[PDB]
Write a structure and sequence with these properties.
This protein has one helix at residues 368-372, and strands spanning 7-10, 17-18, 32-34, 38-42, 51-55, 60-61, 76-81, 88-93, 98-102, 117-119, 126-131, 138-143, 148-152, 157-162, 171-176, 183-187, 191-196, 201-207, 217-220, 225-231, 237-243, 252-255, 263-268, 273-278, 284-289, 296-302, 310-313, 325-332, 336-343, 359-360, 381-382. Strands 1, 2, 6, 27, 28 and 29 form a six-stranded mixed sheet that branches. Strands 7-8-9-10 form a four-stranded antiparallel sheet, with no helix packed on it. It has a single domain (1-344), classed as 7 Propeller (Methylamine Dehydrogenase, Chain H), CATH 2.130.10. The radius of gyration is 20 Å and the shape is globular. The protein has 386 residues and is mainly beta. The protein contains one helix and 31 strands. This is Coronin-1A. Binds actin. Keywords: Acetylation, Actin-binding, Coiled coil, Cytoplasm, Cytoplasmic vesicle, Cytoskeleton, Membrane, Phosphoprotein, Repeat, Ubl conjugation, WD repeat. GO terms for molecular function: actin filament binding; actin monomer binding; cytoskeletal protein binding; identical protein binding; myosin heavy chain binding; phosphatidylinositol 3-kinase binding; protein homodimerization activity.
Amino acid sequence: SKFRHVFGQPAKADQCYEDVRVSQTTWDSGFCAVNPKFMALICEASGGGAFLVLPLGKTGRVDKNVPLVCGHTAPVLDIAWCPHNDNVIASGSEDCTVMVWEIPDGGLVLPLREPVITLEGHTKRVGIVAWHPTAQNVLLSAGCDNVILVWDVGTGAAVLTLGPDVHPDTIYSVDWSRDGALICTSCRDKRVRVIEPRKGTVVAEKDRPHEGTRPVHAVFVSEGKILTTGFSRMSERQVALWDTKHLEEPLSLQELDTSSGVLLPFFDPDTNIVYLCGKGDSSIRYFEITSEAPFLHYLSMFSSKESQRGMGYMPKRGLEVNKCEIARFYKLHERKCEPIAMTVPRKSDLFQEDLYPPTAGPDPALTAEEWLGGRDAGPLLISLKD
C-alpha cells in the first residue's frame, strides 16, 4: 500500500481558530463544516440557534462579538456546505427547520438572520442535512419525526418524502451514493437500508449489522460496498465492511476498543481510505479499502491528548496538493478549532498523480428536475494539478 505511512500533523496554534464557544448540545453530527473558502462550526447559543462562519484565513482568537448566522429560533444540530456553491450553507435546527444561507466573500459584517430559504416540513428537530453530490440544488434532511425530506433549494419545495413507515425509529445517519442514485440510511430499529429515494424502493437491507445497543452509522464506500460503525454486545466498538449484494456476513468485521463514543466514518473515494472519529475520542483512525483480502485494512491512527467535540473535513479543492496533503480534519475542542493535515510522505518534486486522480468538482452534473425525472450521473471531475 502507498498509504502505509499516512500521518496526521496538527496546524500550529496561530493557524487555528481560538476563543470559540463550541456547542454543548449532545448530538452525533460533526458540528463543523469546512470548504476551501470558509470554516463553520456550531456554537453554544441559549437564546436561539447560531453557528460561526469565518474566512479560512481569519485564524487566531475569534473576536468575542463576531457576527454569527442566527436566524434559527432554537439550537442548530447540523450544518453542511453546498458542494456546487462555496458561499452557501444549510443548517438543521431544533426549531424543526432547515435554513439555507448565503455567505459573502469576506464573511459576515453583521449577524445574519434571513436565509435564502426556510425549508418547512419536519415536525420535530432536524439533525441531519445532506446535499446531493451531483444534482443541482438538491438537499436531503432527516428529522426526529423519522421522516426524510428531499428539497429543491432552488424552488423551496419538498420534492420527495420518506415517511415513518420507512424508518419507524430514529435515523442515525443518511449517506448519498457516489452518483446520488441511492441513499444508505441507518436506523435505531437496527436495519441499514439502501434506498432508491425517487421510487422510494429499499434495494438492499441488512438487519443488525452490529449486536450492541448504541448507534450504528453507515456510509457508502467503493462500488458495491458499504461501511458501518457500531458496537458489540459488550459495547466494543466495531467497523464492518459489507458487500451489498451479499449482506449475510461482513467482508470484514473488526473490533476497535471499548468506548461509548459513536465513530463517524469519512470515506475518501480518491484514495479508498476511510477515517473514523468519535466525539469524546482523542484519535482518528484510518483504514484502506481494497478488493484483495481482507478488504478492510487498518492503516494507522493520529493520536493526541485532547478529546474532540466535533470534526470537519476539507474538500479536495482546498488541499495542499503540492505538500502531499490528502485530507485535512478540522478538529473541535471545547473552545478551539484545530486543522489537522493528513499527509503521504513522498520525496519527489513532481505532482503525485497516483495520489490525486480527477476528483468531484464544484459543478453539478444534473439539474434537480433531471435527477427527479430519473437520470443519474456521477460527479463532474476536475484536475487538482490546476
